[PDB]
Write a protein that binds this DNA or RNA. Sequence first.
DNA 1: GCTTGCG
Length: 181
Amino acid sequence: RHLMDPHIFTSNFNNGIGRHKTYLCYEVERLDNGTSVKMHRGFLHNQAKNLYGRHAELRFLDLVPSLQLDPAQIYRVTWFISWSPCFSWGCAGEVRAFLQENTHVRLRIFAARIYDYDPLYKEALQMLRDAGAQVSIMTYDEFKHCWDTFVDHQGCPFQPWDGLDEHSQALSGRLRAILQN
DNA sequence: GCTTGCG
Ligand SMILES: [Zn+2]
C-alpha cells in the first residue's frame, strides 16, 4: 500500500532513457505446491553516492530479515529493476552469497535496461544465472504489471512509451547472447 | 539541466 509516483515510474523504467538513479520493485510469493497465487510487495531506490552509496539490490538484501520468511518454506522473490545488477560494486556477488545462504528462495530479476557502464556487467549477469537466479529483460507485460501493482495510477491503464517493444527486443537479444556464453 | 550522477 506504499505506491510510486507515475512520472517517477515512467522516467526511471523507460528502457530507452538512462537515469542517474535505480528503482527496484519486488514481490514475495510463497509456494506450498504450485499455488504461488499472490501474497510483502514494496519498492525502493539506491542511496545516492555523495563524496560510495548503496546500490538498490543491497538495500533489498538489507530488508530481507524484516520480511520474516519461514526458512522451512520455499518462496519466489521477483525484482523489476530499472538497471541490470552491477558486478563491480559487489551487488551480483552479494546476491549470489544471499542465494547460497537462503536456498528456500527462488529469485527472478527483470531489468528495464542493461547497466553496461560496468565493464563487468556480463560477468554479473552470468554469475547471477549460475547462482540459479532467473535473469530477464522487462517486456510490455512486466512494465504493465509494475504500473498495475506499484504505481499510483488512480485507475489509468498503463500507456507504453514510443519504442518500448523495439528496445525490449534489442535488450532481450543482447542479454540472451550474454547468457549463451 | 541533462540524465547509465554531476556541475
Ligand atoms: Zn550494484
